[PDB]
């Protein structure tokens, strides 16, 4: 079974989200990841990419929930991404998938 280890894989997670101050924001995100130790990628979770997409969406929702609307719009665009990447890394840890994370960037 061949696994495309070296190639960089892309994922898009977008959705209408609720902020802290009862406000609503249209948010999109891109996540670029690699795959290592292909035995983990193949024999741990069914469709690891879909699981990672769901985890990314959950982490993005959780991060946006805490912060207010205006800071998300203008000032928090750096702490939002930093929190989202850490939350995604913590979330996909128990799954023990072969995927390693390169960059989470806020669109």
């Amino acid at each position: 079974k061949p696994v495309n280890v070296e190639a960089v894989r892309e994922l898009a997670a977008s959705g209408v989200m609720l902020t802290s101050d009862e406000n609503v924001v249209r948010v999109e995100m891109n996540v670029q990841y690699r795959v290592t130790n292909p035995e983990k990628y193949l024999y741990s979770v069914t469709s690891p990419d879909d699981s990672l997409r769901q985890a990314t969406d959950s982490a993005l929702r959780g991060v946006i929930g805490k912060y207010t609307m205006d800071r998300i719009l203008t000032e928090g665009r750096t702490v939002i991404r930093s929190d989202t990447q850490r939350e995604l890394e913590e979330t996909i840890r128990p799954y023990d998938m072969g995927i390693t994370l390169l960059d989470v960037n806020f669109q």
Partner: protein
């Protein structure tokens, strides 16, 4: 791998495909996560090409 046409449309509507090589009825779909599969067009669908171009999906014909 073979993936159903309705599932492929749900996938493209959710921004999961990157490039699609169309060979008549047959379509070779490449997802954004570097997974490739093949689908088949059931009947002539005019909305298919518009949906593909609208969602910023690469479309490639063949000889």
């Amino acid at each position: 791998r073979k993936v159903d046409y309705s599932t492929f449309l749900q996938e493209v509507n959710n921004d999961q495909v990157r490039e699609a090589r169309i060979n008549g009825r047959e379509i070779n779909v490449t997802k954004k996560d570097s997974n490739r599969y093949t689908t088949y067009i059931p009947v002539q669908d005019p909305k298919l090409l518009d949906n593909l171009l609208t969602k910023n999906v690469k479309v490639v014909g063949e000889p």
